[PDB]
Amino acid sequence: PIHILAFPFPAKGHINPLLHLCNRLASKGFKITLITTVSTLKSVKTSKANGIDIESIPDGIPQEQNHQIITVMEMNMELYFKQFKASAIENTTKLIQKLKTKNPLPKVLIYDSSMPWILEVAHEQGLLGASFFTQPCSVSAIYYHMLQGTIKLMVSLPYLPLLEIKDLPGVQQFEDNSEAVAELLADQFSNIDDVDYVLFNTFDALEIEVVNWMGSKWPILTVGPTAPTNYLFETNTEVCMKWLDQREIDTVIYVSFGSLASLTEEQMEQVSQALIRSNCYFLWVVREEEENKLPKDFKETTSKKKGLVINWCPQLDVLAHKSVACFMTHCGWNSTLEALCSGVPMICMPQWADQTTNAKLIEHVWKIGVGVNKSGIVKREEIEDCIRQVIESERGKELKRNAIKWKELAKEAVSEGGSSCNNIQEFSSSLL
Numbered sequence: 001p002i003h004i005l006a007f008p009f010p011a012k013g014h015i016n017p018l019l020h021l022c023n024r025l026a027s028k029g030f031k032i033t034l035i036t037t038v039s040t041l042k043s044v045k046t047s048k049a050n051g052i053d054i055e056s057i058p059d060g061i062p063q064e065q066n067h068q069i070i071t072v073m074e075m076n077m078e079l080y081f082k083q084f085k086a087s088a089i090e091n092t093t094k095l096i097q098k099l100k101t102k103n104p105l106p107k108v109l110i111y112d113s114s115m116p117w118i119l120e121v122a123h124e125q126g127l128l129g130a131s132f133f134t135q136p137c138s139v140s141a142i143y144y145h146m147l148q149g150t151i152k153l154m155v156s157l158p159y160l161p162l163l164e165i166k167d168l169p170g171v172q173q174f175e176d177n178s179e180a181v182a183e184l185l186a187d188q189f190s191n192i193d194d195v196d197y198v199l200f201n202t203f204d205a206l207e208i209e210v211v212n213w214m215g216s217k218w219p220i221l222t223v224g225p226t227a228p229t230n231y232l233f234e235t236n237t238e239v240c241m242k243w244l245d246q247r248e249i250d251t252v253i254y255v256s257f258g259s260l261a262s263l264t265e266e267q268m269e270q271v272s273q274a275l276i277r278s279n280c281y282f283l284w285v286v287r288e289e290e291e292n293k294l295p296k297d298f299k300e301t302t303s304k305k306k307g308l309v310i311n312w313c314p315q316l317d318v319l320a321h322k323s324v325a326c327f328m329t330h331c332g333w334n335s336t337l338e339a340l341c342s343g344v345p346m347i348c349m350p351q352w353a354d355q356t357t358n359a360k361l362i363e364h365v366w367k368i369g370v371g372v373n374k375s376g377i378v379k380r381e382e383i384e385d386c387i388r389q390v391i392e393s394e395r396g397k398e399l400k401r402n403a404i405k406w407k408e409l410a411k412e413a414v415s416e417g418g419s420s421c422n423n424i425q426e427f428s429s430s431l432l
């Protein structure tokens with residue numbers, strides 16, 4: 001078989017979409033080796049069934065308690081991203097040298113678009129290099145314009161809706177890391193003309209004009225959603241799906257702020273009271289390190305009547321469940337795309353980076369969500385109003401119909417003859 005190496009950035013919103021692409025490629029007969037940091041591997045709980053080799057490299061940055069890579073990295077982003085980069089260059093080189101003692105020999109390296117310098121490692125090692133963008137073409141275009149200097153982070157950019165300042169990717173939220181973060185985002189396009197394959201986790205129908213514009217510059221391959229319609233980490237699948245199977249159609253608010261965003265105790269309380277004083281069933285993912293900021297008896301007592309509070313869930317299976325009526329989300333791109341492809345309208349509570357832009361696209365372009373309005377805390381009353389809008393109002397019925405329409409276009413994209421299916425086949429055939 002042809003041997004593909006895959007190197008996501010060490011965060012779940014980067015690992016997961018690449019993992020799903022890898023599972024698709026493995027189904028077509030390719031051998032896959034997934035490259036993870038030690039810290040990522042510590043959280044991997046199931047891997048046997050996917051048949052993918054997992055090889056680990058050092059973190060390359062300090063190990064601070066049991067915190068995640070980006071958490072440590074945020075203490076000093078400019079220094080620690082550079083340390084992560086230098087260590088990853090050296091250790092991916094060493095790992096490829098070792099893999100070259102085994103058959104089948106590696107032939108291609110799919111790497112996260114946020115680590116463009118991995119292209120030089122792939123080419124030095126005689127491999128093809130494929131840059132895998134985990135953000136939509138619309139937001140990625142902003143980073144391209146940042147690299148060209150057309151914009152520095154009302155705003156008008158080619159083939160995007162008119163944006164308010166709050167709609168731009170949120171780099172200011174990173175405080176003394178804002179400048180480093182803006183440079184790393186722009187740098188995704190620094191070597192794009194030398195990449196062997198440019199892959200985006202999106203589908204053409206979702207952003208026709210920006211994809212077309214992008215394609216006028218470089219051959220790009222839209223391959224999304226890579227997610228099927230599955231997990232490396234603990235997802236508490238049995239507890240979650242049995243609770244959802246007890247819920248009636250269209251009754252559950254799914255609530256998640258993803259793998260990284262952490263709300264203050266003050267914000268947690270407003271979300272908590274909003275969910276309670278709404279009278280809806282809710283499944284709220286509160287990561288284990290964030291639990292201690294919940295109200296005193298929320299998890300054990302107050303949420304017991306209508307809520308399931310869980311430290312992680314099988315999000316693809318949850319969003320596919322008929323009981324789910326809407327998705328209160330931080331609007332990370334994976335959650336955004338997974339909800340659209342599942343036909344689930346959202347309540348948008350973006351926190352930083354591309355989430356702000358994603359929320360604007362959700363509400364104003366794809367029209368499958370509403371956005372909370374901050375006061376900078378989002379108040380329980382605002383959340384409750386958004387819940388009624390989606391759950392009870394005529395508008396929410398329109399958002400749901402729009403979400404089902406996108407689900408159908410996404411199904412077509414990944415089915416035989418669809419744009420993403422065609423592009424994955426073109427990629428596979430090229431490797432052959």
Ligand SMILES: O=c1ccn([C@@H]2O[C@H](COP(=O)(O)OP(=O)(O)O[C@H]3O[C@H](CO)[C@@H](O)[C@H](O)[C@H]3O)[C@@H](O)[C@H]2O)c(=O)[nH]1
Nearest residue numbers: 012013014016134258259260285312313315332333334335
């Ligand atoms: O209980 C859960 C919650 C989430 N997920 C999955 O976790 C991932 C979350 O990804 P995402 O929605 O993209 O949010 P983040 O966790 O914040 O990660 C991303 O946040 C931004 C998304 O665009 C990007 O900068 C990067 O891809 C990455 O940092 C998705 O695959 C989810 O399906 C679960 O499986 N179970």
